[PDB]
Amino acid sequence: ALSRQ
Amino acid sequence: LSGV
Amino acid sequence: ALSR
Amino acid sequence: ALSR
Amino acid sequence: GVSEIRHTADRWRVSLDVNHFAPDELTVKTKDGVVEITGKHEERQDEHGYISRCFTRKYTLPPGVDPTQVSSSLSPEGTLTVEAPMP
Amino acid sequence: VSEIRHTADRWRVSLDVNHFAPDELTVKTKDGVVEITGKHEERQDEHGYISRCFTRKYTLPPGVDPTQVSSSLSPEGTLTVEAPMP
Amino acid sequence: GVSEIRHTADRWRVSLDVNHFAPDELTVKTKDGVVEITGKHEERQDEHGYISRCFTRKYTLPPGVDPTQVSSSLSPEGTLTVEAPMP
Amino acid sequence: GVSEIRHTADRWRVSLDVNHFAPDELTVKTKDGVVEITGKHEERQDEHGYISRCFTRKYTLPPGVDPTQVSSSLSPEGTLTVEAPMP
Amino acid sequence: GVSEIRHTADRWRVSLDVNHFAPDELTVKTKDGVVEITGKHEERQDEHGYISRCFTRKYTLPPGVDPTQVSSSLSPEGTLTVEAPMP
Amino acid sequence: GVSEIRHTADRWRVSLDVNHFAPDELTVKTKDGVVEITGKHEERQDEHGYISRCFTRKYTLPPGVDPTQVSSSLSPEGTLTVEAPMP
Amino acid sequence: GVSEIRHTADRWRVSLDVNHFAPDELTVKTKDGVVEITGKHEERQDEHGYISRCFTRKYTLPPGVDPTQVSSSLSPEGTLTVEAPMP
Amino acid sequence: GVSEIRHTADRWRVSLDVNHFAPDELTVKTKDGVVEITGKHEERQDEHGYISRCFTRKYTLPPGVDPTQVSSSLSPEGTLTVEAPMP
């Protein structure tokens, strides 16, 4: 789902 | 005759 | 399911 | 304003 | 099921074919000398695909029938029988 | 199902009473307690003839004017009881 | 002589959810061909406040059912079943 | 130049009995690769009393079918045929 | 957006999703048996940023429709319904 | 969550930690001197289980800044930076 | 007679940080063996501007747990603990 | 001597669905630090009638990007992607 790095 |  |  |  | 009329001298009785509906998907209510039968089931798969159904059916009773004595039951073959004693 | 809706300026509760008409419900406040009672006579629902009765009580925050308690029933059967915070 | 097979009468059945009532707070009674089910519990504290409940529900038996053959059983899930053999 | 004979694309087809519904009581719609057939008629008198009906049935189109090329036609007997050309 | 048409024996009706346009930004005119719908709005932020839009849509009416009987109205949800009675 | 201030004499700038939200789940509008940032993602599994989230944060702009010159961009680490020139 | 010591049943528990939410802004509900925690607070002011937040997180209970025995408590540091006894 | 690894600049990106427009009916230009995406197609027939469409969407570029380095590409599905290298 992304946006967490 | 009529939640939450 | 239902009848039948 | 517009409809939505 | 079978959708026929089966009146007698001592009993008003009708049968209705509702093989697509389960017991909990049917309701029978009597008001103002009229029997009202309602059926409704959600979208579900049958032999052809996804389908939802709904219907309302009404019968007119003879005068003097006590609505608290109307009986209704569903057979395993899908025949709904509604009956009541004649005055 | 007594959905609580409190804030910092209003005490509010909503109750599901879809089987009851407006003239079958009563709300009264006494000694820091709101009492809600419903009662309806024998009546046909989706399964047949049935009569129902209940009493429910809620504790008000201390210092609520009982004359500022309002109750209203929506067309879908939600009873909302609310009052302002002092 | 030879052993025989015999048919057995159908059974009438209704189910009712009464999860709010304990077994000793429910009664099942038959009068004039009508099954009366009554629940009642005294004031009780729940998640929101205090609550007392009471209800009486009725079902009309099919004609000819022996009222002395009516039975009922309550499951752990709080569902009450009422059963009777057909004539 | 000379005239030419060309092959034609196969056709997808389903049939449905809807004799209880008039043309103006049926709608055929396609969305997301699914054909949706809806029927609904208001209360009317029949040989047993009064009756209203409603239904919604769905079919999944094969992959590659142009949804704008789906068509239908009702027969006098009450059978609705829906079809569309294959890729 | 999506456009839904339904032509019955008594009425012609089309519903159009124009949920970016205000009532004073839409126009419906009929001439030569064709309904012409035009929308235009100036630069305006939506969920992605500033944008302006314009469109013109035309529908051919069935024979005999009186253009003075065409009605058009926009719902709060942004659906424009244009309809006319059949002769 | 935490918002960092990076104003200068020439540009109004803030950075917001929104690591749970993807680019298509964020919206930045500017109206009447207020920047409004909204986020919403549907139920999905994280390290602890299923969760959904929604938020709306507003910043007040200094007077006289062109709302059409506000730019917003999300970094791959999840930092939303909103920027605009000073008047 | 003498006093007696009794064993006590194990307890299932989960812990969650919700420091941004007040007691009247958190709800704990059980549905079909699933605990659902919902938080929601209206727009308030903070160090950087205005903010409003909402979330819903779910946990699947171990089989056999009595859903009527789920309880929770909020600590001063804003930590919510949910637990229930094992059969 | 040994080979050398070098870092490469980040890229700013936006994506847009324009499946209603053909390639030559779309244009992408930069002016005053803003990207203008314009679509426009003349009247043409579809499954309902005739339709013409136009739109202009804008995006404020991040500070310091070279406007001559803006590029776009249109996938077969109908999504336009615009990107540019960051400082």
Side-chain angles (χ1 to χ4, degrees), chain A residues 1 3, chain B residues 2-3, chain C residues 1 3, chain D residues 1 3, chain E residues 1 3-87, chain F residues 2-86, chain G, chain H, chain I residues 1 3-87, chain J, chain K, chain L:
Chain A
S3 188
Chain B
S2 69
Chain C
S3 28
Chain D
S3 85
Chain E
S3 304
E4 66 181 294
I5 323 303
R6 319 208 305 164
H7 301 328
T8 64
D10 297 357
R11 294 204 64 79
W12 184 93
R13 180 161 77 268
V14 301
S15 296
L16 182 62
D17 177 15
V18 295
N19 59 94
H20 289 321
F21 301 90
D24 62 326
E25 294 169 345
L26 297 157
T27 59
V28 179
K29 302 176 72 171
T30 301
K31 230 294 184 179
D32 297 322
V34 169
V35 177
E36 195 181 279
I37 301 172
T38 303
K40 179 173 182 178
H41 70 76
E42 308 165 1
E43 195 184 271
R44 55 166 162 256
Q45 270 185 308
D46 73 353
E47 55 170 349
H48 299 110
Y50 292 85
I51 171 66
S52 60
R53 298 181 178 91
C54 89
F55 79 89
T56 297
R57 156 84 64 188
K58 296 184 186 178
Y59 301 85
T60 44
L61 291 169
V65 175
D66 183 357
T68 67
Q69 298 299 123
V70 179
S71 159
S72 59
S73 63
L74 182 64
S75 72
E77 291 71 16
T79 303
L80 176 65
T81 300
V82 184
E83 42 187 333
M86 295 288 288
Chain F
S2 295
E3 165 183 323
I4 275 62
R5 299 169 55 178
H6 301 350
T7 66
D9 298 335
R10 289 209 64 81
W11 183 88
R12 185 190 301 95
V13 295
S14 300
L15 182 57
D16 173 13
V17 293
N18 78 94
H19 288 294
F20 297 88
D23 63 356
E24 289 163 349
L25 301 157
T26 74
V27 184
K28 300 174 71 174
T29 303
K30 180 176 174 59
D31 301 328
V33 182
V34 173
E35 184 196 47
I36 307 168
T37 68
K39 181 178 178 179
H40 74 77
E41 301 296 323
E42 205 149 304
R43 171 193 296 158
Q44 284 180 95
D45 68 356
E46 56 272 347
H47 299 112
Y49 288 90
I50 176 166
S51 58
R52 297 181 180 88
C53 93
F54 78 90
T55 296
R56 178 168 287 280
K57 293 158 161 172
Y58 298 100
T59 298
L60 289 170
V64 172
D65 185 350
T67 55
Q68 301 303 136
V69 181
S70 65
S71 302
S72 60
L73 183 65
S74 72
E76 33 275 324
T78 309
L79 179 63
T80 299
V81 182
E82 48 187 334
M85 295 300 304
Chain G
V2 156
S3 73
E4 67 182 288
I5 308 298
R6 296 195 181 186
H7 295 320
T8 306
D10 298 339
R11 278 176 288 94
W12 172 90
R13 172 197 288 263
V14 301
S15 289
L16 179 65
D17 180 56
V18 292
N19 60 280
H20 281 137
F21 302 85
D24 63 354
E25 294 172 346
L26 299 158
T27 62
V28 182
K29 162 180 159 71
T30 303
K31 180 189 294 179
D32 296 320
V34 182
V35 175
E36 293 188 7
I37 305 168
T38 301
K40 163 174 291 183
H41 75 72
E42 301 297 348
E43 194 177 74
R44 176 197 306 163
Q45 188 177 7
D46 73 334
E47 320 93 41
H48 311 283
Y50 288 77
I51 179 65
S52 62
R53 296 181 179 95
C54 91
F55 83 89
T56 295
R57 177 179 293 281
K58 297 183 182 178
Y59 297 96
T60 299
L61 288 170
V65 170
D66 187 355
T68 71
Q69 302 298 282
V70 179
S71 59
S72 59
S73 56
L74 180 66
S75 66
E77 290 73 9
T79 295
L80 179 67
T81 301
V82 184
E83 212 177 17
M86 292 290 287
Chain H
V2 298
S3 67
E4 178 176 16
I5 308 296
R6 290 195 185 178
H7 294 324
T8 316
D10 289 352
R11 290 169 285 97
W12 172 87
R13 177 197 289 261
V14 298
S15 299
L16 177 62
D17 184 323
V18 297
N19 63 95
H20 287 140
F21 300 86
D24 295 358
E25 294 163 347
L26 297 159
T27 61
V28 178
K29 300 159 62 180
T30 307
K31 185 187 181 302
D32 300 328
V34 177
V35 178
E36 197 172 290
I37 303 172
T38 298
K40 165 172 182 185
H41 75 77
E42 302 298 344
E43 186 185 59
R44 61 170 186 249
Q45 185 189 13
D46 69 348
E47 282 178 332
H48 306 280
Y50 301 94
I51 180 69
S52 58
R53 302 180 173 94
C54 91
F55 84 85
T56 295
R57 180 174 290 282
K58 296 175 182 174
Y59 301 88
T60 300
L61 289 173
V65 172
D66 184 355
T68 65
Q69 304 301 312
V70 183
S71 64
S72 61
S73 63
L74 183 62
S75 73
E77 292 75 10
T79 296
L80 179 66
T81 305
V82 186
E83 55 178 27
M86 294 283 289
Chain I
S3 178
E4 189 180 33
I5 292 80
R6 183 163 192 179
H7 180 200
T8 60
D10 286 62
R11 188 181 303 171
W12 183 86
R13 165 161 41 179
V14 57
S15 59
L16 186 62
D17 179 12
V18 290
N19 81 87
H20 290 118
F21 299 85
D24 57 6
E25 293 165 340
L26 297 162
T27 294
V28 178
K29 299 177 71 176
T30 307
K31 182 170 182 61
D32 294 319
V34 181
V35 179
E36 191 186 56
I37 306 173
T38 66
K40 180 179 70 175
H41 73 70
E42 60 182 341
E43 230 174 57
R44 172 184 296 157
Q45 279 173 117
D46 66 1
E47 67 272 20
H48 300 109
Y50 284 87
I51 175 165
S52 61
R53 302 182 174 88
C54 87
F55 80 87
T56 298
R57 167 73 71 171
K58 298 180 181 174
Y59 304 101
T60 62
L61 293 165
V65 177
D66 186 356
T68 63
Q69 298 297 132
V70 180
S71 54
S72 56
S73 60
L74 186 68
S75 76
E77 295 75 16
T79 298
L80 178 64
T81 298
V82 179
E83 61 198 291
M86 297 290 291
Chain J
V2 170
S3 167
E4 169 159 304
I5 308 133
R6 304 206 295 175
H7 298 333
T8 63
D10 289 351
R11 295 200 65 80
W12 183 99
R13 180 169 57 179
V14 300
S15 300
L16 180 62
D17 179 11
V18 295
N19 59 44
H20 299 309
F21 300 87
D24 58 359
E25 296 172 334
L26 296 162
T27 292
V28 177
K29 295 187 175 192
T30 308
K31 210 169 187 179
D32 293 321
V34 176
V35 180
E36 195 185 70
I37 305 170
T38 64
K40 177 178 299 191
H41 75 70
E42 298 174 351
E43 209 187 52
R44 50 170 175 256
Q45 273 197 299
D46 71 358
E47 318 90 39
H48 306 291
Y50 291 86
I51 179 167
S52 63
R53 295 182 176 93
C54 90
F55 84 90
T56 298
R57 176 169 288 281
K58 297 178 188 172
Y59 296 85
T60 304
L61 297 168
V65 321
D66 191 336
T68 65
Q69 300 182 247
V70 176
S71 59
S72 53
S73 55
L74 182 66
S75 69
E77 286 74 23
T79 301
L80 178 67
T81 298
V82 182
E83 236 177 319
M86 292 293 293
Chain K
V2 297
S3 61
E4 67 177 90
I5 309 301
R6 290 197 180 180
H7 290 321
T8 309
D10 291 351
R11 303 188 64 84
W12 169 94
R13 66 173 291 162
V14 294
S15 193
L16 177 57
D17 178 11
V18 296
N19 65 320
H20 286 137
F21 297 88
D24 285 353
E25 295 168 336
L26 299 158
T27 67
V28 180
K29 303 159 69 175
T30 308
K31 286 202 188 71
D32 299 327
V34 175
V35 181
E36 172 182 317
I37 299 96
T38 298
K40 179 173 188 65
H41 75 74
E42 297 162 320
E43 177 171 319
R44 68 165 78 105
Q45 187 183 12
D46 74 340
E47 180 175 7
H48 306 102
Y50 301 90
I51 178 63
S52 62
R53 292 180 256 251
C54 91
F55 82 89
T56 298
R57 179 178 289 285
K58 294 174 181 174
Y59 300 87
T60 300
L61 285 169
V65 167
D66 187 354
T68 64
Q69 301 300 278
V70 178
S71 58
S72 57
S73 62
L74 187 67
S75 79
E77 298 76 69
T79 301
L80 182 65
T81 299
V82 190
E83 50 177 324
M86 302 289 292
Chain L
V2 299
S3 66
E4 176 176 358
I5 305 292
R6 296 197 189 185
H7 295 305
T8 68
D10 295 351
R11 291 166 293 160
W12 169 94
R13 170 184 290 201
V14 297
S15 300
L16 180 61
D17 169 57
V18 298
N19 63 88
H20 283 148
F21 302 85
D24 283 355
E25 292 171 351
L26 300 154
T27 57
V28 175
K29 55 188 290 180
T30 56
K31 182 175 183 178
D32 300 319
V34 174
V35 186
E36 287 190 27
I37 305 169
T38 296
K40 174 170 179 182
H41 75 72
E42 297 293 352
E43 189 185 71
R44 71 197 185 199
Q45 184 180 5
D46 64 359
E47 62 277 12
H48 306 297
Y50 300 86
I51 177 64
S52 62
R53 300 184 183 94
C54 89
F55 83 91
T56 299
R57 182 178 285 287
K58 292 182 179 177
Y59 281 105
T60 304
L61 288 166
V65 308
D66 190 349
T68 61
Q69 304 300 303
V70 174
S71 61
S72 61
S73 59
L74 182 68
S75 70
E77 288 72 20
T79 294
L80 181 71
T81 299
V82 185
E83 47 177 298
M86 291 289 289

